[PDB]
Amino acid sequence: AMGMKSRYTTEFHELEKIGSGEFGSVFKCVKRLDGCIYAIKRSKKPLAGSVDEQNALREVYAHAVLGQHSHVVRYFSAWAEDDHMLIQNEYCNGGSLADAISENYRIMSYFKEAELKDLLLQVGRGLRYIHSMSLVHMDIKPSNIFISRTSIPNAAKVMFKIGDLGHVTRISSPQVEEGDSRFLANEVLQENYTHLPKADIFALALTVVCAAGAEPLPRNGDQWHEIRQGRLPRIPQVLSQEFTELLKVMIHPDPERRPSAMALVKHSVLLSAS
Ligand SMILES: CC(=O)N1c2cnc(Nc3ccc(N4CCN(C)CC4)cc3)nc2N(C)C[C@H]1c1c(Cl)cccc1Cl
Numbered sequence: 001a002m003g004m005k006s007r008y009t010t011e012f013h014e015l016e017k018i019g020s021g022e023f024g025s026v027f028k029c030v031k032r033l034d035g036c037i038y039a040i041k042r043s044k045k046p047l048a049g050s051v052d053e054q055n056a057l058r059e060v061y062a063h064a065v066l067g068q069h070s071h072v073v074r075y076f077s078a079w080a081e082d083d084h085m086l087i088q089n090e091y092c093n094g095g096s097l098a099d100a101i102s103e104n105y106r107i108m109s110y111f112k113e114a115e116l117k118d119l120l121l122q123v124g125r126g127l128r129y130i131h132s133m134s135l136v137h138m139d140i141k142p143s144n145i146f147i148s149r150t151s152i153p154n155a156a157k158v159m160f161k162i163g164d165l166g167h168v169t170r171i172s173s174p175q176v177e178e179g180d181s182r183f184l185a186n187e188v189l190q191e192n193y194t195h196l197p198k199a200d201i202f203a204l205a206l207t208v209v210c211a212a213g214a215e216p217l218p219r220n221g222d223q224w225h226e227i228r229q230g231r232l233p234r235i236p237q238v239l240s241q242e243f244t245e246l247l248k249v250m251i252h253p254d255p256e257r258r259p260s261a262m263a264l265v266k267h268s269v270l271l272s273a274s
Pocket residue numbers: 018019026039040041073087088089090091092093094095096099146163164165
């Protein structure tokens with residue numbers, strides 16, 4: 001809890017809690033001076049000078065570098081007070097893709113093919129930017145993709161944004177902190193980091209597979225290995241042959257054969273979503 005003269009309490013009116021972690025939570029808040037809603041994550045402050053601090057500050061640094069892109073979550077501010085570290089990001093009104101999937105699942109639905117191409121194109125724009133900046137996300141998965149649904153009053157919209165930049169690292173990085181095992185490419189687990197950007201492409205394909213209604217992905221075991229041999233998880237729908245082949249080459253066992261994020265966004269299959 002924060003003090004009543006904290007920056008957090010004075011400058012923001014806290015609304016709804018919107019997420020929870022081990023040592024923190026996320027609130028939907030209004031900033032009093034501008035009237036706009038933000039997501040503010042407040043976590044226990046990492047020990048100053050520690051490796052945990054290093055990892056926390058890397059996230060903020062990634063945000064500061066990447067957050068200008070239209071398909072990466074905007075960052076506004078970060079600070080520390082009351083033994084908490086705070087990050088104020090844009091609030092995304094549709095929650096994460098994991099939340100949108102779970103809502104879909106509850107009503108016996110899924111993203112249909114046109115929605116999946118839209119997802120894939122938009123997050124791939126996101127990755128193209130990240131990779132152009134010599135960075136890799138390393139943790140692409142539905143819970144780290146955020147959704148904003150907007151209405152434009154005076155046109156003469158659903159946006160997917162990459163968030164949770166806590167695993168972002170540079171392309172040539174010799175150590176890599178692995179992301180979610182359900183989405184982790186085999187080469188990264190083996191500690192081959194020659195083609196890091198293609199680990200994000202792999203994770204994105206599996207993320208679109210989850211959007212498309214696949215069952216829970218394995219964290220380990222024979223099914224996990226089967227996926228890493230290049231076999232797509234089963235989905236409860238029949239997608240076009242061309243779109244299925246895009247997804248499948250995105251999980252190719254050789255990273256070099258997976259599309260770049262650039263090739264991805266230029267792909268003829270996704271021209272229908274442009
Ligand atoms: C983009 C973004 O950076 N952040 C974000 C934005 N917007 C939102 N919006 C939302 C709406 C609604 C919901 N749901 C959850 C499911 N229930 C059922 C309804 C509401 C959940 C989240 N939640 C967010 N949280 C959960 C994470 C947060 C964050 C911050 Cl502030 C700092 C560092 C890393 C991250 Cl990932």
